[PDB]
Ligand binder design. Structure first.
Ligand SMILES: CCOC(=O)Nc1nc2cc3nc(NC)[nH]c3cc2c(=O)[nH]1
Ligand SMILES: CCOC(=O)Nc1nc2cc3nc(NC)[nH]c3cc2c(=O)[nH]1
Ligand SMILES: [Cl-]
Ligand SMILES: [Cl-]
Ligand SMILES: [Zn+2]
Ligand SMILES: [Zn+2]
Lengths: 372, 372
């Protein structure tokens, strides 16, 4: 039987790595892209379709699930895996980011965050976050953190990061005090420190002293732009333990993913393929297209000329254009399946190119064609 | 190779019949239920899923397709079958009903109907209707008719029926003058006459003199109620040729279908399973349920206890309740697949019970449990 958690690096090129995470519920090929399951569904896809695209693991939003249908309710029904019908690994976020971005009213303190839902008063703390993630039956549990707004002054970035590190220790202890969770799940810590190298180093040191199964680079993709995100990754990823997975949450566009892998990132999640698919944006190897545009009304070609997904095997741009213009559910279904499949094909090409020692060339060829 | 059209009756019980329609694109088992493809999609289902539920044939709405994406455009793209990815028979309606129920402004005359779309001025006539259905590549073409509003005075019902019969002859001649359509498709005529036996007889006689591949009972399910619909069917169906299919369009609830089969109907279509599925109504052998209701929030049972569909094999009422409450696309997908599968299972039980000479008992047992 598979272990609780084992990360193994099979090949490397520069800072990029390819390998596997073995967990009780399955193997995760890295670098990995996680489709986002907001409220117990990857929007517009059955779980079998998510798997057919190549996904090994999905993400669930703790903030949404604790509000609807409720964490205790999901536990009573047998956990998130059986509730939604996905039997493979699930990573749950902590709630610490969405509580601040999505709540109408919040009160922050050293204890945690109290908030009002957009749909009653609610509470999130390191302890409650770890508990909710346990009730959901999460395989990869995220420490409860604070995502510092950008831009941040050095003082505010430091104060925020320091609180996040105290919360990381509380998250570790809560997780370890629940025997079933400690034996069957993994716990990742989240580095903070905004764009400041010294704070990033202090955060990495604090997380490594506590000890986690994996390490995320938090606090990025919050308005700083790709140049600055890459500059921060340049010095931040090498601070993390080499032998554990490196996770960049909330990223991103295809070129963001490629450059982040070049900088040592092993795991990603983003709503872009699902949300923008529903809005009519399709990813192709020649860049994104907006299927709503009139130029596609009689285009018999598939969304992408090389894509192997079931949507591209069968339906035309012209048909999907009609569905999206008409507001048809099938339009959302087909666009989402293709976009998630495209993202998985990107990850497969990244993995294979690292394994063959030609990732640098792949990245160059990818960028030249995608931005032509 | 299959013929253009062959209807064969394999077994009978009272007025009920079971058999097959063979056409170039496939075999249709009768009595048959046709899921409705409004604008080139059975809403929220891939065509493979429609087929997996047991459907042999789907319906397409001429009124919608001529407005978006357009009949000539669909023809240029290769026809409706390849456009939407359904390779089996498609029955198209004539447009004569939806033009009057859905248009914002209409002008009726002996030539046809001019109208304004809810999304420009447009025109429908017997000739244009048959042409549109040809451009779509329809397998079963419907004569262009007028559905008399209910209630109707004898004078107005007679005038409307007489116009419909003149339009039936024009539909026949238009269809026959297009060699490719006449050789590969079938044409059904539509009986009118409101609730009046003498007008129904005159209409049946006119249609039989013209000659069609099948005959529909038009002008029902327009507010008269089940008792009156059944009373009209009692005398109307025996007026039609016994050796051709009998089609009751726009019907209906499960009990409407059972009683209509008891009265000699072989074919049905209705938006009820799809539309009401998206709205949270699920059909069960114990009657419909509203999955939005709070009583289902922790119900681990499938939608129906006996249903063999993929939704009932995997997901709980509690999960689907959550999806529908949340407005999730997957909720619409799962409810629709189950409801269409339920309707197909109803048709299968009807067919099998007629074949075994126990349809009367099935109808009694069905009604006792469904309305308990
Ligand atoms: C995935 C687990 O993350 C957490 O528990 N906290 C967290 N979430 C983030 C989500 C983000 N999304 C974006 N951009 C779209 N940037 C993000 C940063 C964080 C973060 O610092 N911390
Ligand atoms: C299916 C082909 O029908 C036509 O071309 N004309 C037509 N359509 C109808 C649709 C109806 N839907 C309902 N109730 C929901 N009743 C209907 C009657 C007709 C009709 O008389 N004539
Ligand atoms: Cl995101
Ligand atoms: Cl209907
Ligand atoms: Zn594709
Ligand atoms: Zn079912």
């Amino acid at each position: 039987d598979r272990p609780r958690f084992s990360f193994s690096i099979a090949a490397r090129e520069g800072k990029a790595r390819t390998g596997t995470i073995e967990m009780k519920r399955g193997v995760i090929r890295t670098p990995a892209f996680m489709p986002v399951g907001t409220a117990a569904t990857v929007k517009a896809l059955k779980p079998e379709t998510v798997r057919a695209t190549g996904a090994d693991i999905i993400l669930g939003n703790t903030y949404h699930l604790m509000l609807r249908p409720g964490a205790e309710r999901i536990a009573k029904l047998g956990g998130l895996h059986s509730f939604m019908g996905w039997d493979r690994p699930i990573l749950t976020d902590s709630g610490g980011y969405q509580v601040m971005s999505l709540s109408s009213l919040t009160k922050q303190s050293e204890e945690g965050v109290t908030f009002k839902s957009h749909l009653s008063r609610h509470m999130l703390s390191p302890e409650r976050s770890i508990e909710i993630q346990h009730l959901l039956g999460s395989d990869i549990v995220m420490a409860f953190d604070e995502c510092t707004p950008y831009p941040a002054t050095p003082s505010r970035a430091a104060s925020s990061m320091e609180r996040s590190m105290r919360w990381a220790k509380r998250s570790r202890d809560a997780f370890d005090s629940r025997k079933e969770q400690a034996e069957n799940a993994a716990l990742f810590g989240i580095q903070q420190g905004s764009v400041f190298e010294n704070l990033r180093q202090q955060s990495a040191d604090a997380l490594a002293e506590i000890g986690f199964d994996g390490y995320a680079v938090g606090g990025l993709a919050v308005g700083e732009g790709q140049d600055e995100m890459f500059r921060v990754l340049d010095f931040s990823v090498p601070m993390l333990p080499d032998d554990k997975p490196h996770y960049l949450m909330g990223v991103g566009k295809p070129d963001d993913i490629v450059g982040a892998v070049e900088r040592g990132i092993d795991m990603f999640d983003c709503v872009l393929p699902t949300r923008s698919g529903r809005n009519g944006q399709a990813f192709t190897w020649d860049g994104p297209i907006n299927i709503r545009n009139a130029r596609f009304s009689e285009d018999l070609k598939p969304l992408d000329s090389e894509c192997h997904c079931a949507v591209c095997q069968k339906w035309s741009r012209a048909y999907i254009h009609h569905l999206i213009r008409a507001g048809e559910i099938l339009g959302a279904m087909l666009m989402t399946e293709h976009n998630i499949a495209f993202y998985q094909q990107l990850m497969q090409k990244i993995r294979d190119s690292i394994s063959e020692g030609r990732f640098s060339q792949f990245a160059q060829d990818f960028r030249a064609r995608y931005f032509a």
